[PDB]
Amino acid sequence: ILPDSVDWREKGCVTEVKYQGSCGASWAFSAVGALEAQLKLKTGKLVSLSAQNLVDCSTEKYGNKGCNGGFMTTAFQYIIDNKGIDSDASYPYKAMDQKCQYDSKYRAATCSKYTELPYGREDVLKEAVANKGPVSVGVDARHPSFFLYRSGVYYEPSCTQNVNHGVLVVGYGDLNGKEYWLVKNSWGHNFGEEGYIRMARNKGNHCGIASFPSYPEILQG
């Protein structure tokens, strides 16, 4: 029996909401967000990791296209291959494609492995959020209602299971008669609930939230 609700912000495992601007780098923010939580669990320190590092350096070999989109899972593979990722402080976000400037002197995290969860399984996603930490997911965000969301549990009848926007599931719950996923976005603090959106849960893989989940791990050693 899983907890009725989870919120990894309450364990100090979630950094401030970021603002991607005109650069389509949500995949990079989702990836660093998932890795930030594992880093805090392992080291006790909460430090924002460089989404710009991924935009500039996790490119064609990883199937990623910087400000034109990418994947959280291949971002994790880049961090594994590169043996590190810089802090956001040392390598801050510029919302444009730049030359790779990774510097091991400012490495703030590593990645050992990642896990991909099965397509559409919200029960498996619930277990991973409860037992492993925040989970990178894609959602279908191509609806005016998503851009216009302010509060409550989001439900868009015309949503599809085909994803196009990377976000971070940091928890789940059940409030006001509605089950939801707690989602950290990267559209700044003025979007939604202080930068978060609660999305309908157990409504048939609504907006594809459980289509392509993945999470990284940092192992001892």
Ligand X SMILES: CC(C)(C)OC(=O)N1CCC(CC(=O)N2CCc3c(c(-c4ccc(Cl)c(I)c4)nn3CCCN3CCOCC3)C2)CC1
Residue 126 CB, nearest approach to ligand X (Å): 19
Residue 63 CB, nearest approach to ligand X (Å): 4
- In angstroms, the CA 78 to CA 70 distance is 12
Question: Between residues 90 and 164, which has the closer beta carbon with respect to ligand X?
Answer: 164
Residues forming beta bridges with residue 178, ordered by sequence position:
175
Question: Between residues 135 and 182, which has the closer beta carbon with respect to ligand X?
Answer: 135
Cα dihedral value 89, 95, 99, 105, nearest 10: 10
Given a contact cutoff of 8 angstroms between Cβ atoms, the answer to whether 48 and 29 are in contact is no
Q: Which one of 91-99, 146-154, 163-171, 197-205 is the stretch in contact with ligand X (CB under 6 A)?
A: 163-171
- In angstroms, the CA 117 to CA 95 distance is 29
Among 90, 101, 112, 164, indicate the residue that binds ligand X (CB under 6 A): 164
Verify binding: residue 71, ligand X, rule CB under 6 A.
yes
- In angstroms, the CA 126 to CA 104 distance is 35
Among 138, 171, 192, 195, indicate the residue that binds ligand X (CB under 6 A): 138
Verify binding: residue 213, ligand X, rule CB under 6 A.
no
Among 163, 197, 207, 210, indicate the residue that binds ligand X (CB under 6 A): 163
Q: What phi-psi label fits residue 206: left (phi over 0), alpha (psi between -120 and 50 degrees) or beta?
A: beta
- In angstroms, the CA 98 to CA 80 distance is 21
- In angstroms, the CA 80 to CA 54 distance is 12
Q: Between 95 and 134, how does the x/- string for binding to ligand X read (CB under 6 A)?
A: ----------------------------------------
Q: Between 4 and 33, how does the x/- string for binding to ligand X read (CB under 6 A)?
A: -----------------------x------
Given a contact cutoff of 8 angstroms between Cβ atoms, the answer to whether 200 and 150 are in contact is no
Q: Residues in the site for ligand X, rule: CB under 6 A?
A: 27, 63, 69, 71-72, 74, 138, 162-166, 212
